[PDB]
């Protein structure tokens, strides 16, 4: 399975850890659509940064 | 009116500085403590100032043994 991940808010006003988790996700500018796997790693990433991102499931 | 307090000492940066599950060198110092918060086990020696160090290569493992805190270095397998 694959996930469609899109950022809804901005990077500023958020801490070093959430910013670096976002960089790991690969989301640099707002409203960016990025494709990833369904690993527990990515699940934890989305859990941590869920207030900045919106997730869609494909497949 | 004035105060007679306000002096202090320095900080000698005590505490445990090597944790379990990692690899340490020969003669590596594990814990800096005043008294016997931890106790030596296998391959663990005690310094003049009640510090704990390793005598052999391997991985540090903390444990409990008859109401005590003891540290050990296991002989990790040679690759």
């Amino acid at each position: 399975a694959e996930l469609k991940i899109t950022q809804v808010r901005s990077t500023i006003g958020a801490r070093w850890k959430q910013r670096e988790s976002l960089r790991t996700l690969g989301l640099k500018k707002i409203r960016q659509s990025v494709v990833r796997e369904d690993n527990a790693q990515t699940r934890g990433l989305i859990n941590t940064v869920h207030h900045l991102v919106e997730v869609e499931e494909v497949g | 009116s004035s105060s007679r307090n306000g002096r202090d000492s320095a900080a000698q940066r005590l505490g445990v500085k090597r944790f379990g599950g990692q690899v340490v060198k020969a003669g590596e110092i594990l814990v800096r403590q005043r008294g016997t918060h931890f106790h030596p086990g296998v391959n663990v020696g005690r310094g003049g100032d009640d510090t704990l160090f390793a005598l052999a290569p391997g991985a540090v493992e903390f444990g409990a043994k008859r109401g005590r805190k003891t540290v050990n270095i296991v002989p990790v397998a040679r690759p």
């Binding site: - | 009116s1 004035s2 105060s3 307090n5």
Partner: protein, 136 residues
């Protein structure tokens, strides 16, 4: 005028006053008691005045229990003194009260003057409080 006989150290930082009181939440020495509502600093002089009020109305019968003791101290410098240069001397001892804590406890037969005296005590405390009975 409740003051502890001696304390190991005579000055203490600003106490934390956060959370909901867990100890002494239920009244059991007698029948009737008073429960507070807000966070406050209740002083020994306030305790003395409230106890005087309770006895001054209940007269002959009954007796009083006090579930708090004002042993926390507070410092204050005198006026006309630049701030700093050490701590001031302690002036009044206080008992930090948390919400829902039982302050005073009464055991007197009749509801009328029992509630009357408890209200008399209520009107002298700085924060809101309510009557509570032994029945839950």
């Amino acid at each position: 005028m409740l003051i502890p006989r001696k304390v190991k150290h005579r000055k203490q930082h600003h106490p934390e006053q956060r959370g909901i009181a867990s100890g002494g939440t239920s009244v059991s020495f007698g029948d009737y008691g008073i429960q507070a509502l807000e966070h406050a600093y209740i002083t020994n002089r306030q305790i003395e005045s409230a106890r005087i009020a309770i006895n001054r109305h209940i007269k002959r019968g009954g007796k009083v229990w006090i579930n708090i003791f004002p042993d926390r101290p507070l410092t204050k410098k005198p006026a006309e003194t630049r701030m700093g240069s050490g701590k001031g001397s302690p002036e009044w001892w206080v008992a930090n009260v948390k919400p829902g804590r039982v302050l005073f406890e009464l055991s007197y037969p009749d509801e009328k003057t029992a509630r009357d005296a408890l209200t008399r005590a209520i009107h002298k405390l700085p924060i809101k409080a309510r009557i509570v009975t032994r029945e839950e």
